[PDB]
Structures are given as C-alpha cells and as structure tokens.
C-alpha cells in the first residue's frame with residue numbers, strides 16, 4: 001500500500017486524544033513504542049476549566065468547542081491511518097456536574113471509551129512522563145495544569161506518592177479574583193501544608209511539567225536569546241529561575257494571561273523546595289500514560305539509543321556498521337585512557353549510531369547537515385550539553401579537528417570535557433572510515449594497544465590483508481590523532 | 494543482507510575510476526540510474542602528465558602514486574560492495590612511452606579493462622555530462638584537462654562535432670615555459686582555427702567543465718563571498734567572468750593564496766578560457782561538476798531514463814526515502830498545478846518544474862522537532878546534490894518548503910534565499926506554502942483527500958474564491974482551518990471562504 005521507506009517498519013500508528021482543562025489535543029505516533037515520531041499534532045484551547053472552581057461545571061462554551069474539536073480529531077485519526085485510539089480526560093470532568101454528560105457525548109463522537117483520570121493518576125502519569133524522558137532523574141516533578149498542581153518525588157525509575165494542590169492557573173486566577181497578592185497568599189498557604197515533602201527536594205532537580213510552565217520556559221529562552229529552542233532538558237539554576245519569575249509576576253509595568261499566576265505557583269514551590277535547578281519536560285501525563293502501556297523491555301530500553309538506532313536504520317548506508325562503531329569506540333576509549341561516566345558512554349554510542357545520517361548531502365555540507373539534524377532532533381534523555389557533544393563529534397568527523405565559528409557555540413554549550421571527548425571520537429572515526437567506507441566487516445580488525453617500545457605510547461594494528469587501504473592519508477589522520485591526544489602513535493601489521 | 498531503509502531499492506552500486514592528466518579519482522554511485530546518490534568519493538593528485546608534452550613519457554613518481562591510488566580504490570570499491578566497475582583514462586595514458594606498461598599494471602591491480610578515450614570521445618562524453626546536468630542546455634561545452642581542451646556544441650539533448658585542442662592547463666604551462674604572454678599566443682593560435690564553431694556560440698551559454706576551471710569558479714565564489722558554495726549550475730555573465738579571468742592571470746604581482754603558489758595551473762586555465770570566450774562571446778558561463786564520467790554513465794542508461802527529468806527523479810526519490818506518504822507528495826504536485834490557474838497564475842514550464850519538485854520535497858523534514866522543521870527543510874534542499882536546477886530555482890524550493898512549515902512571514906532566514914530567487918519565485922513559493930498549509934489540515938499528509946477539494950468563484954460578491962469541501966469531509970471543519978485560509982486570503986489579496994457541503 002506504500003513506497004514509503006521513511007517510515008519505521010513493524011509499527012502501526014496510534015492516536016492519543018487528551019481532553020484537558022485548557023487544551024484538547026490530538027497526537028498520532030508512528031507506533032506504541034519507546035521512541036516513535038509524531039505523525040500528526042493538533043491543539044485547540046477550549047477552556048473546559050473556565051469557571052469550574054466557582055460554578056461546579058465545565059464552561060459550556062468550552063464544552064461546545066471541545067466536542068467540535070473531537071469530531072475533527074476523529075476524522076483526522078482515520079485519515080492519518082491510526083489503528084488504535086487512546087483517549088484521556090482531566091480529573092476536572094469528575095468534579096463537574098456536566099462532566100458525565102460531556103464524556104458520554106465525547107465517547108459517541110470518538111467511538112471509544114475515555115479514561116477519566118483521578119488526581120492520583122494525574123500525579124502518577126506526570127511522574128512516568130519525567131521518568132520516561134530523563135536519564136536517572138532525581139528530585140520532585142511539578143505538573144501545573146489549569147485547575148491543579150501535581151507534585152511527586154522522583155528517583156531513577158521510581159516515584160513517591162503524589163499530592164494535588166488546587167493551584168492550577170485558571171483556578172488560582174479565578175479564586176484570587178485576578179489579585180496577584182491574593183494568588184500569592186493562596187499558593188503560600190497550600191504549599192505550606194506540604195513543607196516536608198518539598199523540603200526533601202532541596203539541592204535536587206525540580207522537574208517542571210505543563211503548558212503554562214513550558215510557556216514560562218519559552219519566554220525566557222526568547223528574552224535571553226538562548227540558542228537552542230528545545231524544551232526538553234532546558235535547565236536553569238534556582239536563582240536565575242526565581243529572578244525571571246519575579247519579572248513574569250510583575251508584567252503589568254493580554255491582561256487575561258495565566259503566566260503570572262503560574263509564575264506565583266512555581267515561586268511558592270521553589271521557595272519551599274530550594275532545588276539546585278529547574279529542568280523543563282516536554283513530556284507530561286499523556287506521555288506517562290503511554291509509557292505505562294509499553295512492555296517492560298521497552299520501558300527499560302534507553303530512548304536516546306533507541307531513537308539514534310532508528311535514525312541509522314532510516315538513513316545510514318549500513319545500520320549494522322553504525323552499531324559496530326558504537327562497540328568499537330567503546331573498546332578503544334579506555335586504551336586512550338578515557339575513563340568515561342555512563343552518561344558519556346551513552347552519548348558516544350549515540351554519536352556513533354548517528355555518524356552516517358547525512359551521507360547524501362553534498363560533500364561540502366555533510367558535516368554541517370549532520371550537526372543540524374542531530375541538534376534539531378526530538379531526542380529525550382539527553383542534556384543540552386549532550387546534544388552539543390553528539391552534534392560536535394559528527395561535525396568534527398567530517399570537517400576535521402579544527403574549531404571554527406559554527407563549532408564555537410556548541411563548544412560553549414558542551415563544555416571542555418565533552419568538546420575534547422568529541423574531538424577524540426571525530427578523530428578516531430576518521431582513521432576508521434579509510435578502511436570501512438562506512439560498511440561493516442572491517443572495523444573489528446582495527447585496534448589500538450600499548451607498546452613495549454619506550455618511545456611509543458600506542459600502536460595502531462591493522463591486518464596485513466588491509467595493507468592496500470594504507471598510505472599517506474592514514475598517516476596524516478593518525479598524526480592528527482597523536483597530536484590531539486598527545487600520544488606517540490605507531491602503525492603496525 | 495541489511496536493515497537499511499535509507500538505500501534506494503533495486504540498485505546495485507556502480508564504481509567509476511578515472512585516470513587523468515592531474516589526478517586519479519574513484520566515485521561509487523548508488524546505482525546506474527538517472528539521479529543516484531554518491532556512496533563514496535576519493536581523489537588523489539598524481540601529476541601523470543607532468544613533463545609528458547616534452548618527454549613523451551609520464552613521471553615515475555606520478556606513475557607510482559597513481560598505482561597506489563588504484564590499489565586503494567580497488568579495495569574501497571569492494572568494501573562499498575559495488576557490482577560493476579568502469580575505468581576511464583585520458584588519451585595520453587597510452588600515447589606515453591611508458592603508458593602501455595602502466596595500463597597493464599593498472600588493469601592487473603583493478604582486475605578490469607581501462608577504456609582509453611580519444612580526445613573526440615572525451616568531447617562527446619563531456620557533452621553528455623552537461624546534457625545530463627542541465628535542463629535543456631544551449632551553447633558550447635568546454636572541458637579543460639591537464640593535456641587537452643575539448644569544445645562541443647550543445648542544443649537541448651542533441652550535440653555537435655566534438656573537437657580537441659592541445660590546450661590543457663599543465664601542457665600549456667610547460668609549452669609556454671611558464672610565460673603568460675607566450676601561453677596567450679599558443680592559446681590564441683589554436684582557438685583561432687576554430688573561430689567558426691565558436692562564433693556560433695555567441696549570445697548563448699558556455700558550459701565550463703574540468704578541474705582547473707572548477708577551481709577558478711571556487712576562487713571566484715570564495716573571493717566574491719557568494720553564499721551558496723554549490724558548483725553545479727553556478728553561472729556568471731561574460732563581462733564579470735572576463736574581469737575575474739584577468740585578475741587570475743595577473744595574480745603574481747587579498748588574493749594571497751594563489752599569488753604565492755608559483756606551481757599553480759590557474760593562470761594558464763584562465764588564459765585558455767579567455768581565448769575561447771573572446772572567440773565565442775556567450776551571454777554567460779555556467780559551470781558543471783559533471784563531466785566525462787557522468788556523460789559516460791548517462792550513455793549506458795536506457796532512453797527512458799535519459800529523457801526522465803533528473804531534478805524530479807531525485808525529488809521523488811527523496812519523497813520515497815523520507816516523506817510520510819510518497820503517493821501523497823505526488824498528489825500535491827498534481828493538485829497544486831490545477832489550483833494555481835484559479836488564483837490567476839500562468840506559470841512557465843520552468844516554474845512548473847520547480848513547483849512540482851517543491852511538492853515532492855515538502856514532507857522530507859517531518860521528523861524534525863516542530864520548531865526546526867522549516868529551517869531543516871530549507872537546509873536539506875539547499876545542501877542537496879540536485880542537477881538540472883539553477884541557483885534561483887534552488888532558492889525557490891527551499892523558500893516554498895520553509896513557508897509551508899513556518900508560515901508566510903519573512904525574516905533574516907528567508908532574506909538571503911528571497912534575494913537569490915527574486916520577487917517572482919519568492920511570491921510563487923509563498924503561494925505554494927500557503928496552499929500546502931491549508932490542505933495539510935485535511936490530508937494529515939496522507940493520500941485520498943486533496944483531489945476532492947477545489948477552489949472556485951463565489952456567487953457571493955463579498956467572496957472571490959470559495960474552498961469547496963464535499964459532505965464526506967464535513968467533520969474536518971474547525972478553528973485551525975479558518976485561520977490558515979485567512980492567512981492565504983491576506984497573502985493573495987482575495988477574499989476566501991470554505992463551503993462545507
């Protein structure tokens with residue numbers, strides 16, 4: 001039914017509809033897997049939660065718009081060829097007198113049962129979304145929605161019991177009657193009740209989830225001119241964050257904005273918690289829900305290495321060679337005395353899996369195209385410095401170990417240690433490509449080792465078979481490596 | 494076997510080694526097809542023709558280096574899993590005293606015969622290299638090797654008599670004894686005896702092929718600050734080209750790169766080109782990265798493959814490789830052509846080619862983070878090895894697809910490309926981006942919907958065009974579709990409305 005090679009095989013697309021207190025959203029994924037791409041996305045800001053705190057009903061004008069959006073989401077899901085649909089709804093639908101009627105009507109439109117979450121499940125699925133999107137997280141997640149603020153402790157693949165605070169942006173702005181002062185008093189009082197839970201987050205990371213907070217992050221990126229407009233893993237120290245929140249709070253000198261009330265919610269949490277830093281999550285309840293439906297093996301898999309391998313499958317001349325490299329660089333690094341952290345090893349593996357993705361690009365731009373595709377991919381479980389590292393390693397592999405004006409800013413984001421490790425990988429891959437042509441079967445017969453020679457640090461050993469690959473070019477790229485590493489290299493059969 | 498979804502299917506890779514006066518090169522292509530990607534690429538400078546003019550023999554040091562290049566290229570062609578090898582050599586390869594032994598050694602190393610091409614076969618294959626890389630070329634093609642110059646008239650897919658002059662850059666530098674005035678005499682004499690063939694090129698295009706002439710183009714781009722460092726389809730008017738060639742000639746007494754390299758062939762290539770251009774007086778010079786070896790493979794294609802449009806073949810291949818639906822990419826190419834006339838656009842055949850390519854390429858960056866989709870589309874299209882497309886046509890495609898993902902506004906990213914493409918192509922790219930933005934909201938980038946959707950005149954005097962939606966698609970109606978159609982209304986200055994039947 002399709003010529004499409006640009007689509008991962010073995011995956012049937014799946015639609016997830018998320019009915020929230022503010023937005024109603026459709027996303028279609030390639031499949032229910034660890035790292036699928038988004039095949040379609042749509043969001044309508046219905047405001048089902050407007051007035052709910054005051055009236056006990058979802059906003060009727062919002063009910064009308066939400067139902068219209070669902071009719072359209074239904075036909076888009078079909079047109080997008082989704083074979084399964086999951087629908088989630090806000091806990092608000094339970095606290096609304098018109099909730100049951102609304103859900104019934106939504107179910108008739110979508111032909112499908114709707115999972116209406118509890119505050120407990122909202123907190124749980126917020127935590128799963130952080131767990132799924134970060135490598136070894138540690139701190140407290142906060143998901144600010146339209147009506148509620150969920151807080152839950154996180155450590156690696158575990159979470160604590162969630163708490164739910166009535167401090168969502170819609171609720172707080174309505175209850176405060178738009179008074180920033182009153183909004184502060186309400187936030188302060190409710191946060192105060194959980195001083196102990198929060199106090200346990202001091203010096204750890206605050207994981208900030210949800211639309212209003214994501215909007216606070218986007219605005220700070222724009223005003224500070226941050227070069228990578230990438231929510232996932234965007235991180236600020238506590239003091240920079242508290243400082244920017246004060247500015248959001250006092251932005252009188254749309255007056256219908258939730259941003260100040262959201263700013264107050266976060267400030268009151270951060271004052272009770274005192275985390276070292278705030279890390280933003282593009283992933284939330286919806287992604288945490290899907291995480292819970294994966295298999296155990298998929299939950300356990302590394303979403304960065306899964307996405308990097310998928311890109312190799314999709315773009316490399318040889319996916320099999322991409323994996324060879326990852327293992328080979330693994331064995332070689334310790335021979336160059338590099339003692340890498342597990343985070344560093346993860347990133348090197350990713351870099352190797354991504355090393356051949358730009359091969360069809362005009363030769364003058366292969367390095368630059370690699371750098372941009374890598375930097376702009378929707379990876380999770382990678383820090384911004386880690387993105388810089390993987391982009392750099394692959395740029396350096398094409399354009400040499402020299403720094404220039406296009407490497408500078410990535411070098412500044414990576415920091416010195418990751419920049420150096422990147423040069424080393426780029427240097428190592430260049431010597432290897434002269435034997436491999438980016439195809440398998442060759443690289444496992446190449447190796448560095450120690451010398452008995454007092455006047456040689458490492459020896460590069462090639463089979464006598466591969467002597468016709470050898471010459472002036474190898475010796476050039478081998479001398480560049482020796483220069484970089486400060487080690488006397490030697491070639492042998 | 495392999496998991497590789499990023500290899501075009503049904504293609505055996507093909508290697509071509511070519512042995513020239515100045516270098517030996519290996520290229521591995523994905524396969525023998527109209528627009529295949531380059532799997533592998535390597536060039537070693539050998540200087541085989543150094544001294545050959547005077548001595549009648551190639552240097553031992555050049556022969557030694559070329560043979561080591563070929564031993565390496567042998568194992569690389571196999572490692573790349575190529576299923577066929579072609580080896581082409583210059584006429585001088587055999588005419589050299591020590592050539593027959595070299596050819597024999599090289600054939601042993603490679604396990605394969607070497608086609609030693611006459612100056613006339615090179616002339617013809619250079620023509621086919623130009624024919625294959627340009628849309629309806631019209632002028633004279635010139636290929637400057639180290640030993641000889643070829644000249645051949647090109648008219649669309651047809652071509653004239655191929656001639657050869659002993660005006661290679663290395664040869665001319667040696668026969669002149671390094672004297673630029675003497676070189677001008679040797680070149681004017683040889684070109685003067687083909688004044689009639691060249692006078693026929695007046696007002697047409699000179700297609701410049703070969704290593705040294707390519708380096709003249711790169712230097713001009715480098716010194717001029719030209720933003721798209723893309724050789725194929727790079728084009729200069731006569732008066733600018735002649736000015737630059739004059740600076741190249743007098744370069745010894747900025748610019749410090751070539752002024753210091755006293756062993757450079759560029760001043761002599763600049764002399765040879767000047768004398769051709771004075772005898773010819775073309776409107777413009779267009780450079781070709783394609784030459785003898787591409788024109789040679791082009792001759793082994795089927796007649797259907799040769800007549801197929803390589804820009805469109807490559808755009809479709811990228812849709813096959815990358816798009817959510819290649820079938821839909823093609824629906825878009827069809828649908829938009831039938832919609833333009835409703836908006837009062839009468840497009841030229843070239844403009845239509847490009848629009849089609851833009852549609853086939855619109856979805857190649859769908860996996861990119863949504864903030865970077867437009868920018869990624871723009872960069873992939875700019876950095877891709879398309880042929881039969883001009884630099885303004887490149888800008889069109891990139892802009893069209895940038896607007897599609899990013900909205901119809903201009904910014905510092907679109908200014909350089911808009912400048913290159915010009916106001917007509919820019920506004921056609923905006924129109925296409927605006928139209929693609931609306932239909933996406935019905936299609937979800939998948940097939941079966943868009944052909945049922947049409948624009949037409951409205952009987953309402955307050956609406957100029959209505960977008961007609963069959964009742965089958967009534968539930969696609971929404972808030973998001975309304976905003977996008979109004980962006981198109983503001984763009985086109987026509988009042989638009991949906992009609993959901």
Ligand SMILES: [Cl-]
Nearest residue numbers: 897898930933
């Ligand atoms: Cl879009």
Ligand SMILES: [Cl-]
Nearest residue numbers: 973974976977
């Ligand atoms: Cl939109």
